[PDB]
């Protein structure tokens, strides 16, 4: 046992991959498009896993064979993995339109999302530099593939190509960090690396190998989560690639890499020596998010920079290693993920447009006004308007930054969040109260986006009325680390 | 003297990043891999030398050569005689681990090779099989026979 | 070597630590056989309704049933194992006190 | 070969006899080494094993000295490879020490 | 069975080879210590001659990476 | 804690000593002697620095005797 969430989603992907390939290449069925049929069974292989994973909550830690060799599951990995499967559930659900309406017979996009979700399930529970890297690269490779998928429009091909370059180079940096750390420590297991890196104090104790190793691991990660000084393509990556694959590689790698960072940087190496780069990254990420969001037009690129900025607002919870800080970071991932699944569900509802900016996003207050209400709710949530959930995320993050004595980090966070609040209030006003601007009309969204947008819109507005479950979950996850 | 001849790899690595003629770039790529395998031989890691040869300069730089040819860019030792009674060849002492103890880091590269297969298929099938060779998909009852253009 | 010793283990009275297969599956309560049966149904249905559009209703139903069998069986196994082992409610100790 | 110089050939040639005899000295040396691998701490047990084994060689080179010479000729010719001459191995073992 | 015969022969001659190597290495170590105490002159140099242990255990002194390869 | 030719690695013993310490010692210090032992095995930093100081003082004496 203890791999039943992985044993299943690997067997299910094979059952789907063989089932899809046999039919799509079948004369008897007139070569049908197996997308939305290997899907549906895809996202159920997710829910049955999410049921196999959530149920066996004490059983995930059922063996030792895995412990000091391969991967260690605990309450943090368990809760964060129930989230990845849930956030993979939303991401497959929002794509169902992209399979039927958009002409995709390529079902193996589904089985590649499923293999990537297995890679991420092994990232969350990755507890050894080798396992961390292997699962990271499994998910990153599935995502290079499914981001370079659209071969007709050259815009998605070069976007996927620079995504592959950026990801392979980020993984090279991360792997050189793993090499320096291993080479200077002779131990890759986080359980072993923890014992060595107690009292390491790089800035006080001369250890250059371990220092450069942790620095390169942090740089590789901050590349993967596309933080500010190393985003370097992330806007073009999110803009050029198709919309659902953007929704995938924009929310799920964040969750997974951030859980992986919590593993290596709060247990494998615990010191105030490494979180300095994350402090600088947080500052400049909130800065870049605010300003570039003020600058962008294309809604896809606007969401790209908004996600970069919000990833910044996450790392301030990691910029201090206190339990309140880690819990703030986890609160920030759940309220950033559910809100991003919502924003991408909205952007996927508007399939009719080509690559079009907020001006063409207009008229939604008139055509489909409830969708405009939902979009304003989501954008407010990113801004952090008090009566919403994103406010709770940013506010608990700032309160953890204050309790951690990083008053300047809280200050830059509040000024950047107020800049974002102004920009998004102005965006909502321009969308609602003026600027008709050419009235592009939309085919209706399907039930799958509808429930996800509806449930998530309910979650954002009716969150402060019941934050006890999520706060308990994230504080338990922080304690478990 | 062959120890310090890693300078060959060092300069050939500087060539690939400072070359406009792609044939020279791939040639010095192959050279970097050959000298890196020479190095991995000097360390006694014989298995990894041959694996570098095979899966780099018989597969990967083969790929890169294809991308160039087509699609042109334009004393005091104390040897302990224990642990020498049964010398473990590098393959045996990689197999004693990779397949039984760290076997999940070996079934995950299995999934990565499977994802590479699925990827090379979905990417470079190039509409040359059932991806689009299904049919032009033109039906009669759905046509208007051009009487009214 | 391997050992079934677990973290957060034995929260309930263990019945048979490390149950052998063909016993932990012969321990299926009429609830497990009802979990393994509802999962296989919700997986056959989503496997038929899904395939009516591409014309593959039969074979997509069969592959949804294969997914459901694998998943619901591994779930019934999780339950009956965490029951035989000390992980779950485990009210089936009468089966040991009687036999 | 010659006087009982504990060469490679003459040692791997008599290893059967060094196994039957001089087993206590060998196991004592190994017990020391597995206790602590510092060379000094059983230099005495090293002298002890080397003493009984040089004695065993000087014994094997007295009775059956021609047989214990053809077999070491083997083991020097084929470098300590047993199967390459089982004839010399048998003729040496059969004449005096089994 | 042939490989077990060969390995049994090797393990049996192992104590003699290891005793010879112990004597040789301890002689080289005595001469290296008498060289250290001579290059250091014992007033300015390492006030403790050998002091190589660095904890309660012994290890062969030092070398490059892999000589036997 | 493996080795390139089996055989318990080079200092899986030092790592077992540094892990048994970190197992039943409540602080990262008072188990740091074993940590420096283990890193000494890994990189031979102490041994190499001592050998280099030996050779450096020898070379300085020899040069002062040669050139004077």
């Amino acid at each position: 046992l203890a791999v039943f969430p992985e044993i299943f989603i690997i067997n299910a992907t094979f059952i789907l991959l063989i089932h899809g390939v046999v039919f799509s290449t079948s004369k008897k069925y007139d070569y049908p498009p197996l997308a939305s049929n290997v899907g549906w069974l895809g996202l159920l292989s997710v829910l049955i896993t999410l049921l196999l994973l959530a149920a066996g909550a004490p059983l995930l830690t059922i063996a030792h064979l895995f412990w000091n060799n391969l991967f260690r599951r605990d309450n943090f990995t368990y809760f964060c993995q129930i989230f990845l499967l849930l956030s993979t559930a939303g991401t497959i659900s929002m794509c169902f339109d992209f399979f039927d309406q958009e002409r995709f017979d390529a079902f193996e996009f589904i089985v590649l999302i499923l293999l990537s979700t297995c890679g991420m399930l092994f990232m969350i529970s990755a507890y050894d530099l080798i396992a961390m890297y292997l699962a990271i690269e499994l998910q990153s490779l599935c995502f290079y593939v499914i981001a370079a998928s659209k071969r007709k429009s050259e815009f998605s091909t070069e976007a996927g190509l620079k995504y592959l370059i950026l990801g392979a180079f980020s993984s090279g940096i991360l792997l050189f960090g793993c090499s320096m750390i291993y080479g200077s420590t002779g131990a890759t297991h986080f359980d072993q690396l923890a014992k060595i890196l107690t009292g390491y104090e790089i800035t006080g104790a001369r250890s250059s190998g371990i220092f450069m190793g942790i620095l390169f691991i942090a740089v590789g990660f901050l590349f993967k989560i596309t933080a500010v000084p190393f985003h370097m393509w992330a806007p073009d990556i999110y803009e050029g690639s198709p919309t659902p694959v953007t929704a995938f590689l924009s929310i799920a790698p964040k969750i997974s890499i951030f859980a992986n960072i919590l593993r290596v940087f709060i247990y494998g190496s615990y010191g105030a020596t490494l979180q300095q780069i994350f402090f600088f990254c947080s500052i400049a990420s909130m800065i870049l998010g605010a300003l570039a969001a003020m600058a962008q037009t294309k809604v896809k690129r606007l969401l790209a920079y908004s996600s970069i900025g919000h990833v910044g607002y996450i790392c301030i919870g990691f910029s201090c290693g206190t339990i309140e800080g880690i819990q703030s970071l986890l609160i920030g991932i759940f309220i950033y993920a559910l809100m991003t699944m919502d924003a991408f569900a909205i952007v996927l509802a508007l399939r009719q447009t080509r690559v079009k900016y907020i001006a063409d996003l207009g008229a939604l207050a008139k055509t489909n006004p409830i969708l405009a209400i939902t979009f304003s709710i989501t954008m407010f949530s990113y801004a952090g308007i008090p009566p919403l959930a994103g406010f709770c995320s940013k506010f608990y993050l700032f309160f953890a930054a204050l309790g951690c004595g990083a008053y300047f980090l809280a200050l830059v966070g509040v000024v950047t969040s107020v800049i974002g609040c102004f920009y998004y209030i102005r965006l909502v006003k321009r969308m609602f109260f003026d600027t008709p601007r050419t009235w592009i009309l939309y085919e209706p969204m399907d039930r799958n986006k509808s429930l996800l947008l509806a449930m998530t819109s309910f979650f954002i507005t009716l969150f402060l009325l019941y934050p006890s479950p999520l706060f308990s979950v994230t504080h338990q996850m922080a304690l478990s680390l | 003297i062959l120890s310090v001849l890693s300078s060959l790899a060092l300069v050939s690595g500087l060539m690939v990043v400072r070359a406009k003629n792609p044939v020279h770039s791939v040639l010095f790529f192959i050279l970097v891999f050959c000298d890196t395998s020479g190095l991995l031989l000097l360390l006694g890691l014989d298995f990894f030398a041959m694996i570098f040869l095979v899966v780099y300069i018989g597969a990967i730089a083969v790929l890169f050569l294809f991308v160039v040819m087509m699609f042109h860019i334009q004393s005091l030792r104390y040897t302990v005689y224990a642990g020498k009674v049964r010398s473990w060849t590098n393959l045996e002492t990689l197999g004693n681990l990779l397949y039984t103890y760290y076997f999940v880091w070996f079934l995950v590269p299995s999934l990565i090779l499977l994802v590479a297969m699925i990827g090379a298929i979905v990417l470079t099938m190039h509409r040359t099989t059932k991806v689009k060779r299904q049919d032009v998909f033109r039906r009669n009852a759905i046509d208007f026979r051009r009487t009214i253009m | 070597n391997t050992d079934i010793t677990a973290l957060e283990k034995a929260q309930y009275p263990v019945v048979d630590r490390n149950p052998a297969f063909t016993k932990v599956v012969g321990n299926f309560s009429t609830l497990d056989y009802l979990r393994f049966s509802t999962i296989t149904g919700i997986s056959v249905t989503v496997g038929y309704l899904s395939g009516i559009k591409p014309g593959i209703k039969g074979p997509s139903m069969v592959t949804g049933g294969l997914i459901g069998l694998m998943g619901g069986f591994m779930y019934a196994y999780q339950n009956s194992a965490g029951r035989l082992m000390g992980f779950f409610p485990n009210d089936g100790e009468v089966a040991s006190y009687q036999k | 070969t010659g006087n009982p110089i504990p060469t490679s050939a003459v040692l791997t040639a008599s290893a059967k006899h060094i196994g039957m005899r001089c087993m206590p000295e060998n196991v004592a040396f190994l017990k020391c080494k597995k206790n602590d691998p510092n060379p000094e701490k059983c230099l005495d047990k090293g002298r002890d094993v080397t003493r009984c084994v040089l004695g065993l060689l000087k014994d094997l080179h007295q009775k059956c000295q021609k047989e214990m010479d053809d077999y070491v000729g083997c083991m020097y010719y084929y470098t300590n490879e047993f199967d390459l001459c089982r004839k010399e191995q048998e003729a040496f073992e059969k004449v005096c020490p089994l | 069975a042939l490989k077990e015969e060969k390995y049994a022969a090797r393990r049996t001659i192992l104590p003699i080879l290891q005793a010879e190597e112990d004597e040789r290495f301890v002689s080289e170590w005595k001469k290296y210590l008498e060289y250290e105490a001579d290059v250091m002159k014992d007033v300015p140099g390492w006030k403790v001659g050998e002091n190589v242990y660095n904890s309660g255990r012994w290890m062969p002194p030092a070398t490059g990476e892999l000589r036997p390869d | 804690g493996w080795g390139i030719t089996g055989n318990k690695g080079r200092c899986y013993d030092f790592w077992m000593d540094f892990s048994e310490c970190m197992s039943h010692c409540r602080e990262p210090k008072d188990c740091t002697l074993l940590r420096e032992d283990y890193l000494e095995c890994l990189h031979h930093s102490k041994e190499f620095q001592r050998r280099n100081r030996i050779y450096k003082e020898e070379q300085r004496k020899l040069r002062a005797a040669s050139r004077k």
Binding site: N68 | - | N1 | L30, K34 | - | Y12, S19
Partner: peptide, 23 residues
């Protein structure tokens, strides 16, 4: 989290061992 020794002592005897298989 000191979950290493419980496997080390557990499997040290099988392989990856310097001198036990000797005697």
């Amino acid at each position: 989290p000191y979950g290493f020794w419980t496997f080390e002592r557990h499997n040290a005897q099988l392989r990856w061992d310097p001198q036990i298989s000797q005697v």
